[PDB]
């Protein structure tokens, strides 16, 4: 069962935000990216978005987002995002997205409506971490198994929680309009609004679905009308004003927490050894940059660590006490000389 | 500024010090140790009884 997991985010709504770079410029968008985390080894990254996923206006793959206070929905396979190459969206749940695509320097996320394209790009570093000691850029078809950390594919109630807050007052210039001589305020049906003005003196009025006109005001730009909502909490976003008083009403769990799993890691080619009197030579040919670590079995190791990305030649000396080395991810190889 | 001081190992008594500066007024220090513990690092081997 998963509806009990989804129940937490039925209590919230999407929210408009500011994003520095839409397709035009400094902009207000529904897809503002708050933060990005890239700690998993296989390129799995977590995006914290301003929209909601998996909830209809319960459906599998959809994006639920906000338009000047009006909630709208789109199929999930329309939105895209990229850093340097086209990324791939896996799944979404609430304010979080799990993505799998290679390294880069900026995150761009975009989608296309019937005629208007929405997008923006944020410059937060995304890093690709190789496992083991064989640097690569795309995981291999075959190799061996290791234990690294990858981000879990499914949602569950973990010990990590976030905080919501009571929403603030949202100014909307659309509500206010000019009558013949007064200012007309038309709050939306089934919701309350707050009108504050200084056209004459200080004014404050809570209207509840009432079309009221105020005297002494001629132009409309003098003053403002807001929107009030009690339910449908919002995340502790830094891009919003806060409400009045203690701003705390619970917390929600964060899915897609990291976990331990089995990892495919490449295997380097076998180095060809040639032996001589108290010495060894390693004919060597790497497919990718790889680490040599070499040690002696005496009181002092003379440990040597080296990164090689080209064919090369190395001649090592070995004594009776012993020599040991690791190339790539092979088990360590120990050689022990003999009198001759 | 570094200042070294010596403390007798005995609780129940006060101890006064003055930190002297050539160009500034002396600074007082008052110290009273209340309780000192000498805890040993002990391991468990076995237990016996009737």
């Amino acid at each position, epitope marked *: 069962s998963t509806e009990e997991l989804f129940n937490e985010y039925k209590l919230t709504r999407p929210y408009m935000a500011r994003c520095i770079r839409c397709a035009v410029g400094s902009c207000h968008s529904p897809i503002a990216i708050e933060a990005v985390k890239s700690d998993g080894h296989d390129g799995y990254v977590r995006l914290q978005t301003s929209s909601q996923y998996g909830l209809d206006s319960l459906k599998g793959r959809t994006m639920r987002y906000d338009m000047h206070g009006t909630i709208k929905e789109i199929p999930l396979h329309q939105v895209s995002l990229y850093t340097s190459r086209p990324c791939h969206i896996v799944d979404g749940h609430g304010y979080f997205l799990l993505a799998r695509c290679p390294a880069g320097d900026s995150i761009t996320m975009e989608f296309k409506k019937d005629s208007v394209r929405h997008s923006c790009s944020v410059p937060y570093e995304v890093k690709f971490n190789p496992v083991g000691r064989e640097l690569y850029t795309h995981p291999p078809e075959h190799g061996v198994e290791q234990a690294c950390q990858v981000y879990a594919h*499914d949602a*569950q109630n*973990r*010990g*990590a929680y976030v905080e919501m807050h009571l929403p603030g007052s949202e100014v909307d210039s659309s509500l206010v309009s000019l009558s013949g001589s007064s200012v007309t305020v038309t709050p939306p049906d089934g919701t309350s609004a707050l009108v504050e003005c200084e056209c004459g003196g200080t004014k404050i009025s809570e209207t509840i679905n009432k079309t009221k006109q105020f005297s002494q005001c001629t132009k409309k730009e003098q003053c403002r009308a807001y929107r009030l909502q009690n339910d449908k909490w919002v995340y502790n976003s830094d891009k919003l004003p806060k409400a009045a008083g203690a701003t705390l009403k619970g917390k929600l769990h964060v899915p897609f*927490l990291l*976990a*331990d*799993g*089995k990892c495919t890691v490449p295997l380097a080619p076998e180095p060809m050894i040639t032996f001589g009197f108290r010495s060894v030579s390693l004919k060597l040919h790497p497919k990718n940059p790889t680490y040599l670590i070499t040690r002696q079995l005496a009181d002092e190791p003379h440990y040597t660590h080296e990164l090689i990305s080209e064919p090369a030649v190395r001649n090592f000396t070995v004594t009776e006490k012993g020599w040991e080395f690791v190339w790539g991810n092979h088990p360590p190889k120990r050689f022990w000389a003999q009198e001759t | 500024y570094e200042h070294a001081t010596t403390m007798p190992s005995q609780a129940g008594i006060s101890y006064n010090t003055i930190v002297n500066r050539a160009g500034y007024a002396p600074l007082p220090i008052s110290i009273t140790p209340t309780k000192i513990k000498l*805890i*040993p*690092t*002990v*391991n*468990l081997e076995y237990v016996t009884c009737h």
Partner: nanobody
Amino acid sequence: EVQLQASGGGLVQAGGSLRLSCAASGSIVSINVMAWYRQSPGKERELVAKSSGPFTLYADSVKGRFTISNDAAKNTVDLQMNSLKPEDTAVYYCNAEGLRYPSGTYGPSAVWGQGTQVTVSS
């Protein structure tokens, strides 16, 4: 010297629900890592569960069928099992790592209990 005592388990039919309990006793005050490990015959040891304070972890083949709860006050970890499969036949061990002795002579880091055998019949 801290020791871990395991209890629970036993014989059951396919689809049953059991409980495993591991308790820590000795010169300990606070514990960090509660974990469970399973070892089937002819195979190496593997992790099944991992609990540490509020966080809990699960392996790939065991999601949605095992639940882990830790009580730091009693320093016990309880593993609730539901809807068991014939692949679950193995001996289960409980692990404790990151032990904080209350001075509390510093000693071995990790400890191990005897474990319990769990067998489900098809």
